[PDB]
């Protein structure tokens, strides 16, 4: 086997700054006859298929921005990105093709940006869901940074933790922010026992939580 390892596993860089990442092969990838290193780099943006950036270690594929440079030889290789852009958010993989093919484990590149507070929206259960006996209350927390955030649900002023489902998006390729959805699911019967439904977001951008609420009796 040829074993491929990458580092770091992940890192975060601000726009305009330089990125360096490494790929190691357990044996030399340098072909004596052709005198090339059979090592390629791929970029895989969130939700996309992988794209080839560099092959033969240092040959930039046509169309690939000049800020991407591959270097190294033998068992050790480097991908350098200068003047990193928000759109460069992705997982980068190296791949050997000296003996069949093997991919490294990937390096996840995140983008650092200025802190931004979330925009919070709350939604009562729809009449179509209630008809079926269920009641989901949804809270969107959009376009914030950093990713770390705390959401609590208060029903009639009291915290509820059971029945919550949280999901974060990948970082945005354009504004480098995150978003999160939080869904509280109750039975129609439990929903109709209480009035006040509140989702409270605490984020480092403010010492006061962002609070969105509605009262069922006033829907």
């Amino acid at each position: 086997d040829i074993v491929m390892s990458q580092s770091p596993s992940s890192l975060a860089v601000s726009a305009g700054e330089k990125v360096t990442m490494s790929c190691k092969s357990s044996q030399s990838l340098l072909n004596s006859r052709t005198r090339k290193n059979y090592l390629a780099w791929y970029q895989q943006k969130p939700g996309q298929s992988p794209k080839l950036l560099i092959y033969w270690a240092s040959t930039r594929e046509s169309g690939v921005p000049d800020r991407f440079t591959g270097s190294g030889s033998g068992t050790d290789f480097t991908l350098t990105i200068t003047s990193v852009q928000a759109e460069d958010l992705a997982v980068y993989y190296c791949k050997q093709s000296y003996n069949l093919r093997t991919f490294g484990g990937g390096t996840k590149l995140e983008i650092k940006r200025a802190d931004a507070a979330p925009t919070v929206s709350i939604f009562p259960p729809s009449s179509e869901q209630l008809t079926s006996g269920g009641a989901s209350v949804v809270c969107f927390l959009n376009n914030f940074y950093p990713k770390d955030i705390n959401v609590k649900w208060k029903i009639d002023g009291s915290e509820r933790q059971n029945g919550v489902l949280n999901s974060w998006t990948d970082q945005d390729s354009k504004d480098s922010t995150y978003s999160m959805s939080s869904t509280l699911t109750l039975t129609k019967d439990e929903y109709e026992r209480h009035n006040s439904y509140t989702c409270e977001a605490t984020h480092k951008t403010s010492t006061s939580p962002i609070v969105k609420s509605f009262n069922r009796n006033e829907c």
Partner: protein
Amino acid sequence: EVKLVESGGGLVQSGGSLRLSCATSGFTFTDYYMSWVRQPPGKALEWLGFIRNKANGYTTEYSPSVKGRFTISRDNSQSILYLQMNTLRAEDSATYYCARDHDGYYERFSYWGQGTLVTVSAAKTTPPSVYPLAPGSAAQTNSMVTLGCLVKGYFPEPVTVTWNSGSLSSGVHTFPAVLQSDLYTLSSSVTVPSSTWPSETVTCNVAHPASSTKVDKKIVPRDC
């Protein structure tokens, strides 16, 4: 324009078999090696195998991880690549990509398909319920408005969500599904100027290929 399009992904039980296909166009199929690569959700790419080009007798090689269990073949008349998978296991659940490989001058995977998702599970196919997310009747409406769709209780992945058939793409956040007792739920938000809704229609288009579900859900205001 070069085209690689995978098909055949879906739900299959442990022990079972599944054949994937990859239809190609925009290049001379026989001049190229073709590879299959997979990727379990949230994990690394894994090369599975290739089939060589015409000059190399269309011979095959496999990763040790799948050799003896997966078979690659190709239809040179139609320019279609196949992957036959047998004795499937949980670890085989993944997105499967076909990729144009070696042309003998170039070490590189130049073109990849969009991928097809295979889920190995005993759980049954369940279509999603799709619910509109409109501000409540105590919405103090302001400059911008955020609407959404809750896509609840389906299996297996994936679902696709668009807004106004694709016309609305900016200001959209589709949240990754999360699995809770054997069913997935996801949501999607869209943000638009208040002047445009509800004066103009906003509709989420949801599809769940495994159940052939197609849903258009119009977001209607709770007064209005």
